Design a binder for this molecule. Structure first.
Ligand SMILES: Cc1cc2nc3c(=O)[nH]c(=O)nc-3n(C[C@H](O)[C@H](O)[C@H](O)CO)c2cc1C
Ligand SMILES: Cc1cc2nc3c(=O)[nH]c(=O)nc-3n(C[C@H](O)[C@H](O)[C@H](O)CO)c2cc1C
Lengths: 97, 97
């Protein structure tokens, strides 16, 4: 199975470039501002990465430069928005339905 | 669980715009040229869409204009590449890794 369907979108507003790692920050909309936190895994259109820090409604994520070229993450540009979805490192997974 | 990890990438080479639907074509690399076919579901960085047609190594996919704005698919631009992964409409037993 697979849906690639996103809970909501994010607005690229700032790029943070560190010679050790690349960092990108987006602006979380009203329905993604709630629940998300640092260390969370956000998938941008389906590419999972973790929150390095939250700048209020904004969230910076970490991104390896070679991973950026290897992935299609490098394509991101500020002023654009991203399909963002919340991912969890671990879950109880009782079952439910 | 969630990985957002892509089998390989695709190069946007042509956009096909139809007033009824928007169409986008990418260039499939050597390890994605094998196996993929029209009517298949490719996820571009994790957004699943179906192949409208294959142009040799290229593949055009369908994309609704409002879906494009609602998603972050509209962000695509020719000359760029995309994280592309193969998805199947149905499987005997999730026999896909
Ligand atoms: C659970 C998970 C989290 C990941 N997080 C990131 C990330 O925060 N930044 C990144 O550039 N790649 C991330 N990746 C991509 C992966 O670690 C690796 O970089 C690519 O698969 C190959 O470059 C993640 C992959 C997985 C499975
Ligand atoms: C299985 C599946 C396939 C989808 N295929 C496409 C597609 O080919 N083109 C597109 O613009 N959206 C596609 N979507 C997105 C979805 O149908 C719908 O457009 C968005 O969730 C809301 O606009 C697909 C969603 C699912 C679950």
């Amino acid at each position: 199975m697979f849906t690639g369907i996103v809970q909501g979108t994010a607005k690229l507003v700032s790029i943070d470039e560190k010679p050790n790692f690349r960092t990108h920050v987006v602006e979380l909309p009203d329905h993604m501002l709630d629940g998300l936190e640092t260390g969370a895994s956000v998938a941008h259109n389906g590419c999972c990465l973790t929150v390095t820090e939250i700048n209020g409604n904004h969230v910076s994520f970490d991104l390896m430069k070679e991973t950026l070229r290897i992935t299609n993450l490098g394509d991101l540009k500020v002023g654009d928005w991203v399909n963002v979805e919340r991912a969890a490192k671990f879950s109880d997974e009782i079952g439910g339905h």
